[PDB]
Short mmCIF file of all heavy atoms in Angstrom, two decimals:
data_model
loop_
_atom_site.label_atom_id
_atom_site.label_comp_id
_atom_site.label_asym_id
_atom_site.label_seq_id
_atom_site.Cartn_x
_atom_site.Cartn_y
_atom_site.Cartn_z
N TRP A 35 -8.56 11.90 1.23
CA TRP A 35 -8.42 13.15 2.00
C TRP A 35 -7.18 13.84 1.63
O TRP A 35 -6.23 13.25 1.13
CB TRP A 35 -8.32 12.82 3.53
CG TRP A 35 -9.60 12.27 4.04
CD1 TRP A 35 -10.04 10.98 3.89
CD2 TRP A 35 -10.57 12.90 4.92
NE1 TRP A 35 -11.23 10.80 4.56
CE2 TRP A 35 -11.52 12.00 5.18
CE3 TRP A 35 -10.60 14.24 5.38
CZ2 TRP A 35 -12.65 12.31 6.01
CZ3 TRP A 35 -11.76 14.53 6.18
CH2 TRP A 35 -12.77 13.62 6.47
N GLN A 39 -0.21 20.27 7.34
CA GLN A 39 0.52 20.52 8.58
C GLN A 39 1.50 21.70 8.35
O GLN A 39 2.50 21.54 7.61
CB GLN A 39 1.25 19.27 9.02
CG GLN A 39 1.95 19.36 10.37
CD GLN A 39 2.53 18.03 10.80
OE1 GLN A 39 2.92 17.14 10.00
NE2 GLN A 39 2.58 17.84 12.13
N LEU A 45 -2.10 19.01 12.84
CA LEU A 45 -2.65 18.52 11.58
C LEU A 45 -4.06 19.01 11.42
O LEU A 45 -4.88 19.05 12.38
CB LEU A 45 -2.67 16.95 11.58
CG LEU A 45 -1.22 16.29 11.61
CD1 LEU A 45 -1.25 15.01 12.43
CD2 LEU A 45 -0.77 16.03 10.19
N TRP A 47 -7.47 18.89 8.47
CA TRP A 47 -8.12 18.45 7.18
C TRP A 47 -8.36 19.65 6.30
O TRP A 47 -8.68 20.72 6.75
CB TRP A 47 -9.37 17.53 7.42
CG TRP A 47 -10.61 18.35 7.71
CD1 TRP A 47 -11.01 18.90 8.87
CD2 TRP A 47 -11.66 18.60 6.75
NE1 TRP A 47 -12.27 19.50 8.71
CE2 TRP A 47 -12.68 19.30 7.42
CE3 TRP A 47 -11.91 18.30 5.39
CZ2 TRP A 47 -13.84 19.77 6.81
CZ3 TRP A 47 -13.04 18.68 4.74
CH2 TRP A 47 -14.01 19.42 5.45
N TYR A 95 -0.42 16.25 2.94
CA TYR A 95 -0.51 14.79 2.92
C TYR A 95 -1.86 14.38 2.24
O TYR A 95 -2.87 14.99 2.46
CB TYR A 95 -0.51 14.26 4.33
CG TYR A 95 0.75 14.51 5.15
CD1 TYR A 95 0.80 15.45 6.14
CD2 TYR A 95 1.94 13.78 4.82
CE1 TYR A 95 1.98 15.69 6.84
CE2 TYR A 95 3.10 14.04 5.55
CZ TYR A 95 3.09 14.95 6.53
OH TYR A 95 4.25 15.21 7.24
N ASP A 101 -8.72 0.49 6.09
CA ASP A 101 -9.54 -0.52 6.71
C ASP A 101 -11.08 -0.37 6.34
O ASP A 101 -11.73 -1.35 6.04
CB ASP A 101 -9.44 -0.52 8.25
CG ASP A 101 -8.19 -1.37 8.73
OD1 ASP A 101 -7.36 -1.81 7.88
OD2 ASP A 101 -8.07 -1.51 9.94
N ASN A 105 -12.20 3.98 10.93
CA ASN A 105 -12.45 5.43 11.02
C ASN A 105 -11.15 6.26 11.30
O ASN A 105 -11.23 7.40 11.73
CB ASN A 105 -13.52 5.78 12.06
CG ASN A 105 -14.91 5.15 11.70
OD1 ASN A 105 -15.38 5.34 10.57
ND2 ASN A 105 -15.50 4.48 12.63
N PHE A 107 -7.05 7.41 9.65
CA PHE A 107 -6.21 7.54 8.54
C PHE A 107 -5.15 6.48 8.56
O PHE A 107 -4.07 6.67 9.18
CB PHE A 107 -5.58 8.90 8.41
CG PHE A 107 -6.59 10.03 8.37
CD1 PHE A 107 -6.69 10.88 9.44
CD2 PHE A 107 -7.41 10.27 7.23
CE1 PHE A 107 -7.63 11.94 9.43
CE2 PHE A 107 -8.27 11.26 7.21
CZ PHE A 107 -8.44 12.11 8.30
N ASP A 108 -5.39 5.32 7.96
CA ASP A 108 -4.47 4.16 8.00
C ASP A 108 -3.25 4.40 7.12
O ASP A 108 -2.15 4.05 7.49
CB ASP A 108 -5.16 2.90 7.49
CG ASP A 108 -6.26 2.38 8.41
OD1 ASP A 108 -6.36 2.89 9.58
OD2 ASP A 108 -7.01 1.50 8.00
N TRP A 110 -1.01 7.20 4.76
CA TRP A 110 -0.59 8.54 4.52
C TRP A 110 0.43 8.60 3.40
O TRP A 110 1.18 7.67 3.20
CB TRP A 110 0.03 9.20 5.76
CG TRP A 110 -0.88 9.27 6.95
CD1 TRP A 110 -1.27 8.26 7.78
CD2 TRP A 110 -1.46 10.48 7.46
NE1 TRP A 110 -2.11 8.75 8.74
CE2 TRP A 110 -2.23 10.14 8.61
CE3 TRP A 110 -1.41 11.83 7.11
CZ2 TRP A 110 -2.91 11.05 9.37
CZ3 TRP A 110 -2.14 12.79 7.86
CH2 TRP A 110 -2.88 12.39 9.00
N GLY A 111 0.46 9.68 2.63
CA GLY A 111 1.49 9.91 1.66
C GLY A 111 2.80 10.32 2.34
O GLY A 111 2.84 10.50 3.54
N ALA A 132 34.41 33.13 13.47
CA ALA A 132 35.80 32.86 13.81
C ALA A 132 36.02 32.37 15.21
O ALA A 132 35.42 32.89 16.12
CB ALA A 132 36.69 34.03 13.47
N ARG A 136 36.35 34.39 23.40
CA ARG A 136 34.98 34.36 23.81
C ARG A 136 34.23 33.15 23.21
O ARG A 136 33.02 33.01 23.39
CB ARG A 136 34.23 35.66 23.39
CG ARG A 136 34.98 36.97 23.60
CD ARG A 136 34.93 37.41 25.08
NE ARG A 136 35.47 38.78 25.19
CZ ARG A 136 35.42 39.48 26.33
NH1 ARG A 136 34.88 39.01 27.46
NH2 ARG A 136 35.90 40.71 26.35
N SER A 137 34.98 32.36 22.44
CA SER A 137 34.49 31.13 21.81
C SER A 137 35.15 29.88 22.36
O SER A 137 34.81 28.75 21.97
CB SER A 137 34.75 31.26 20.29
OG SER A 137 34.72 29.98 19.68
N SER A 139 36.08 27.53 25.82
CA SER A 139 35.74 27.18 27.20
C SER A 139 36.37 25.82 27.41
O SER A 139 36.12 24.92 26.60
CB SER A 139 34.25 27.15 27.42
OG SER A 139 33.66 25.94 26.92
N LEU A 148 27.97 31.43 9.28
CA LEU A 148 26.63 32.05 9.25
C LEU A 148 26.20 32.13 7.80
O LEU A 148 26.60 33.00 7.05
CB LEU A 148 26.66 33.46 9.87
CG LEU A 148 25.31 34.18 9.96
CD1 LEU A 148 24.25 33.36 10.68
CD2 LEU A 148 25.50 35.56 10.67
N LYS A 150 23.57 33.17 5.42
CA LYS A 150 22.55 34.21 5.60
C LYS A 150 21.81 34.66 4.36
O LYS A 150 22.40 34.59 3.27
CB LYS A 150 23.20 35.44 6.30
CG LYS A 150 22.21 36.26 7.11
CD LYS A 150 22.66 37.68 7.31
CE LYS A 150 21.58 38.57 7.93
NZ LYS A 150 21.21 38.13 9.29
N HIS A 171 27.27 20.90 14.69
CA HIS A 171 25.88 21.23 14.87
C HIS A 171 25.40 22.17 13.83
O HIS A 171 25.74 23.39 13.84
CB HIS A 171 25.65 21.87 16.27
CG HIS A 171 25.85 20.85 17.41
ND1 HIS A 171 24.90 19.96 17.75
CD2 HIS A 171 26.83 20.76 18.30
CE1 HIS A 171 25.32 19.31 18.79
NE2 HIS A 171 26.48 19.75 19.15
N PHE A 173 22.20 24.06 12.48
CA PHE A 173 20.92 24.47 13.08
C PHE A 173 19.78 24.58 12.02
O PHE A 173 20.11 24.81 10.87
CB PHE A 173 21.06 25.78 13.88
CG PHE A 173 21.90 25.60 15.10
CD1 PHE A 173 23.29 25.85 15.11
CD2 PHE A 173 21.34 25.22 16.30
CE1 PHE A 173 24.06 25.72 16.21
CE2 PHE A 173 22.12 25.09 17.48
CZ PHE A 173 23.47 25.33 17.40
N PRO A 174 18.52 24.48 12.43
CA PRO A 174 17.41 24.81 11.61
C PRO A 174 17.42 26.27 11.17
O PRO A 174 17.88 27.17 11.89
CB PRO A 174 16.17 24.61 12.55
CG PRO A 174 16.64 23.70 13.64
CD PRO A 174 18.11 23.79 13.71
N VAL A 176 15.99 29.92 10.26
CA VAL A 176 14.92 30.84 10.71
C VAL A 176 14.51 31.68 9.56
O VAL A 176 15.37 32.28 8.86
CB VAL A 176 15.41 31.72 11.94
CG1 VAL A 176 15.72 30.89 13.14
CG2 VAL A 176 16.59 32.67 11.56
N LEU A 177 13.21 31.82 9.36
CA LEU A 177 12.62 32.71 8.33
C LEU A 177 12.68 34.13 8.98
O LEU A 177 11.98 34.39 9.97
CB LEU A 177 11.18 32.32 7.97
CG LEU A 177 10.43 33.19 6.98
CD1 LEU A 177 11.19 33.30 5.62
CD2 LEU A 177 9.07 32.61 6.78
N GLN A 178 13.46 35.02 8.40
CA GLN A 178 13.60 36.36 8.88
C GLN A 178 12.43 37.17 8.35
O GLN A 178 11.76 36.80 7.43
CB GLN A 178 14.93 36.98 8.40
CG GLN A 178 16.16 36.19 8.91
CD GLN A 178 17.46 36.54 8.08
OE1 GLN A 178 17.53 36.34 6.89
NE2 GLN A 178 18.44 37.03 8.83
N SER A 186 23.03 28.93 11.02
CA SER A 186 24.44 28.74 11.43
C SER A 186 24.76 27.27 11.42
O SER A 186 23.90 26.41 11.77
CB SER A 186 24.68 29.39 12.72
OG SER A 186 23.95 28.85 13.79
N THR A 190 32.63 22.24 17.39
CA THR A 190 33.53 22.39 18.56
C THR A 190 34.75 21.52 18.32
O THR A 190 34.65 20.29 18.12
CB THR A 190 32.84 22.02 19.90
OG1 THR A 190 31.85 21.02 19.73
CG2 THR A 190 32.20 23.25 20.55
N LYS A 216 33.57 28.62 2.49
CA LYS A 216 34.14 29.67 3.35
C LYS A 216 35.21 29.04 4.28
O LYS A 216 34.94 28.09 5.06
CB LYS A 216 33.08 30.37 4.16
CG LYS A 216 33.56 31.61 4.87
CD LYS A 216 33.81 32.76 3.92
CE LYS A 216 34.86 33.73 4.42
NZ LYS A 216 35.15 34.81 3.44
N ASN B 35 -8.65 8.17 17.64
CA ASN B 35 -7.50 7.54 17.11
C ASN B 35 -6.24 8.19 17.65
O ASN B 35 -6.25 9.40 18.02
CB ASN B 35 -7.48 7.56 15.56
CG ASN B 35 -8.88 7.38 15.01
OD1 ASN B 35 -9.55 6.36 15.22
ND2 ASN B 35 -9.34 8.40 14.24
N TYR B 37 -2.05 8.78 16.73
CA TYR B 37 -0.99 8.72 15.68
C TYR B 37 0.36 9.03 16.33
O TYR B 37 0.43 9.75 17.38
CB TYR B 37 -1.28 9.70 14.56
CG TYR B 37 -2.60 9.52 13.90
CD1 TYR B 37 -3.77 10.15 14.46
CD2 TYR B 37 -2.78 8.69 12.82
CE1 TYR B 37 -5.02 9.95 13.91
CE2 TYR B 37 -4.04 8.51 12.21
CZ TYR B 37 -5.16 9.12 12.79
OH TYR B 37 -6.42 8.96 12.24
N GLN B 39 4.11 10.74 15.07
CA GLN B 39 4.86 11.38 14.04
C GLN B 39 6.27 11.72 14.54
O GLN B 39 6.49 12.28 15.56
CB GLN B 39 4.15 12.69 13.62
CG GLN B 39 4.79 13.28 12.35
CD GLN B 39 3.99 14.45 11.89
OE1 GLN B 39 3.46 15.26 12.69
NE2 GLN B 39 3.92 14.58 10.55
N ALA B 44 5.64 11.51 7.70
CA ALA B 44 4.20 11.59 7.90
C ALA B 44 3.70 10.87 9.16
O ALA B 44 4.43 10.04 9.67
CB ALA B 44 3.50 10.96 6.63
N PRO B 45 2.52 11.19 9.66
CA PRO B 45 1.99 10.45 10.79
C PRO B 45 1.72 8.98 10.54
O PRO B 45 1.53 8.55 9.41
CB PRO B 45 0.60 11.15 11.11
CG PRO B 45 0.76 12.49 10.47
CD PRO B 45 1.64 12.33 9.23
N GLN B 56 -3.35 -0.81 15.91
CA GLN B 56 -3.27 -0.91 14.47
C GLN B 56 -2.30 -1.99 14.02
O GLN B 56 -1.49 -2.46 14.73
CB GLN B 56 -2.85 0.50 13.90
CG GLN B 56 -3.19 0.78 12.45
CD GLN B 56 -4.68 0.83 12.19
OE1 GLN B 56 -5.29 -0.13 11.71
NE2 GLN B 56 -5.29 2.01 12.48
N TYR B 88 -0.36 12.42 18.48
CA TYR B 88 -1.54 13.18 18.29
C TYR B 88 -2.77 12.27 18.44
O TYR B 88 -2.76 11.10 18.01
CB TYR B 88 -1.65 13.75 16.86
CG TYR B 88 -0.55 14.67 16.44
CD1 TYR B 88 0.58 14.22 15.83
CD2 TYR B 88 -0.68 16.08 16.61
CE1 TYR B 88 1.62 15.08 15.40
CE2 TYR B 88 0.30 16.93 16.24
CZ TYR B 88 1.43 16.45 15.63
OH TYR B 88 2.42 17.30 15.25
N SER B 92 -12.86 10.96 15.39
CA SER B 92 -13.48 10.50 14.14
C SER B 92 -15.01 10.33 14.30
O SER B 92 -15.60 9.54 13.53
CB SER B 92 -12.80 9.19 13.66
OG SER B 92 -12.95 8.15 14.65
N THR B 95 -16.70 15.43 11.58
CA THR B 95 -15.64 15.84 10.73
C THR B 95 -14.28 15.86 11.54
O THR B 95 -14.29 16.34 12.72
CB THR B 95 -15.95 17.27 10.11
OG1 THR B 95 -17.24 17.27 9.68
CG2 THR B 95 -15.04 17.47 8.89
N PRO B 96 -13.20 15.33 11.01
CA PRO B 96 -12.01 15.08 11.80
C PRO B 96 -11.41 16.32 12.43
O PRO B 96 -11.33 17.42 11.77
CB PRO B 96 -11.00 14.50 10.78
CG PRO B 96 -11.86 14.01 9.66
CD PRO B 96 -13.00 14.92 9.54
N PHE B 98 -7.93 17.15 15.26
CA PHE B 98 -6.80 16.60 15.96
C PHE B 98 -6.48 17.36 17.22
O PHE B 98 -6.84 18.51 17.37
CB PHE B 98 -5.55 16.68 15.05
CG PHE B 98 -5.59 15.81 13.83
CD1 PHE B 98 -6.37 16.19 12.70
CD2 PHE B 98 -4.92 14.58 13.76
CE1 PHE B 98 -6.40 15.40 11.56
CE2 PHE B 98 -5.00 13.79 12.61
CZ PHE B 98 -5.74 14.24 11.49
N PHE B 116 28.98 30.57 24.07
CA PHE B 116 30.00 31.26 23.24
C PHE B 116 29.38 32.42 22.50
O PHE B 116 28.18 32.37 22.14
CB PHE B 116 30.55 30.27 22.19
CG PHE B 116 30.93 28.98 22.72
CD1 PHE B 116 30.13 27.88 22.50
CD2 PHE B 116 32.13 28.82 23.47
CE1 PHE B 116 30.54 26.60 23.02
CE2 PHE B 116 32.53 27.60 23.91
CZ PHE B 116 31.71 26.46 23.76
N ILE B 117 30.12 33.51 22.34
CA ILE B 117 29.62 34.69 21.63
C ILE B 117 30.53 34.97 20.44
O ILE B 117 31.77 34.80 20.47
CB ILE B 117 29.50 35.94 22.60
CG1 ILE B 117 28.47 37.00 22.02
CG2 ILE B 117 30.84 36.55 22.93
CD1 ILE B 117 28.03 37.99 23.07
N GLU B 123 33.75 40.89 6.94
CA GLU B 123 33.13 40.61 5.66
C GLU B 123 31.66 41.05 5.64
O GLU B 123 31.15 41.59 4.61
CB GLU B 123 33.24 39.13 5.31
CG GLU B 123 33.00 38.80 3.83
CD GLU B 123 32.71 37.31 3.60
OE1 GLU B 123 33.14 36.49 4.46
OE2 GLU B 123 32.14 36.96 2.55
N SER B 131 25.43 40.88 12.26
CA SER B 131 24.84 39.79 13.00
C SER B 131 25.77 39.32 14.10
O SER B 131 26.93 38.91 13.81
CB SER B 131 24.55 38.64 12.01
OG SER B 131 23.48 39.06 11.10
N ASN B 137 25.78 25.43 23.86
CA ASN B 137 26.16 24.10 23.33
C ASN B 137 25.90 22.98 24.36
O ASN B 137 26.30 23.06 25.52
CB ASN B 137 27.67 24.13 22.96
CG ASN B 137 27.94 23.36 21.63
OD1 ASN B 137 27.15 23.41 20.66
ND2 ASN B 137 29.05 22.61 21.62
N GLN B 160 16.67 36.02 16.71
CA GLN B 160 15.95 34.76 16.44
C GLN B 160 16.79 33.54 16.92
O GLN B 160 17.96 33.48 16.70
CB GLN B 160 15.69 34.64 14.94
CG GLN B 160 14.71 35.66 14.41
CD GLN B 160 14.26 35.42 12.97
OE1 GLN B 160 15.03 35.54 12.04
NE2 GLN B 160 13.04 34.98 12.85
N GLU B 161 16.10 32.65 17.59
CA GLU B 161 16.62 31.40 18.10
C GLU B 161 16.36 30.22 17.21
O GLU B 161 15.44 30.26 16.39
CB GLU B 161 16.11 31.07 19.51
CG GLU B 161 16.46 32.04 20.63
CD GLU B 161 15.90 31.59 21.97
OE1 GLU B 161 15.09 30.64 22.03
OE2 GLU B 161 16.36 32.14 23.02
N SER B 162 17.13 29.16 17.44
CA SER B 162 16.91 27.88 16.75
C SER B 162 17.52 26.79 17.60
O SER B 162 18.66 26.93 18.03
CB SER B 162 17.57 27.98 15.36
OG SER B 162 17.35 26.78 14.62
N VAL B 163 16.76 25.72 17.87
CA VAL B 163 17.25 24.61 18.67
C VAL B 163 17.40 23.38 17.79
O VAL B 163 16.60 23.17 16.89
CB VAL B 163 16.30 24.27 19.84
CG1 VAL B 163 16.96 23.27 20.81
CG2 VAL B 163 15.93 25.52 20.59
N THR B 164 18.43 22.58 18.01
CA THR B 164 18.59 21.29 17.34
C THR B 164 17.71 20.25 18.04
O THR B 164 17.11 20.50 19.06
CB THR B 164 20.08 20.84 17.29
OG1 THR B 164 20.49 20.55 18.62
CG2 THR B 164 20.95 21.88 16.63
N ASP B 167 20.67 15.18 20.65
CA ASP B 167 21.85 14.63 19.97
C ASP B 167 21.77 13.19 19.67
O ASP B 167 22.49 12.68 18.75
CB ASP B 167 23.16 14.98 20.76
CG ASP B 167 24.36 15.18 19.89
OD1 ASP B 167 24.80 14.20 19.17
OD2 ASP B 167 24.97 16.28 19.96
N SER B 174 21.44 21.87 21.47
CA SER B 174 22.21 23.08 21.24
C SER B 174 21.31 24.18 20.71
O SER B 174 20.32 23.90 20.08
CB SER B 174 23.39 22.78 20.27
OG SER B 174 24.22 21.76 20.82
N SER B 176 21.26 28.22 18.88
CA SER B 176 21.89 29.32 18.21
C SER B 176 20.87 30.49 18.24
O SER B 176 19.83 30.45 17.55
CB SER B 176 22.24 28.96 16.79
OG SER B 176 22.72 30.08 16.04
N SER B 208 30.01 38.36 26.77
CA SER B 208 30.01 39.64 26.09
C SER B 208 31.30 39.97 25.41
O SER B 208 32.34 39.32 25.62
CB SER B 208 29.57 40.78 26.98
OG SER B 208 30.58 41.11 27.91
#
Side-chain angles (χ1 to χ4, degrees):
Chain A
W35 295 74
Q39 186 173 30
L45 295 146
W47 81 280
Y95 298 106
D101 277 7
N105 297 308
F107 302 109
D108 293 348
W110 296 74
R136 315 284 189 172
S137 159
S139 77
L148 183 56
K150 207 201 171 66
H171 290 284
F173 292 91
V176 296
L177 180 59
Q178 301 165 299
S186 61
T190 31
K216 192 73 208 177
Chain B
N35 322 302
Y37 304 87
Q39 191 174 34
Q56 201 66 261
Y88 299 91
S92 60
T95 319
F98 295 78
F116 313 104
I117 202 165
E123 194 196 340
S131 294
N137 220 41
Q160 296 190 285
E161 293 184 347
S162 184
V163 191
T164 65
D167 210 298
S174 300
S176 172
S208 70

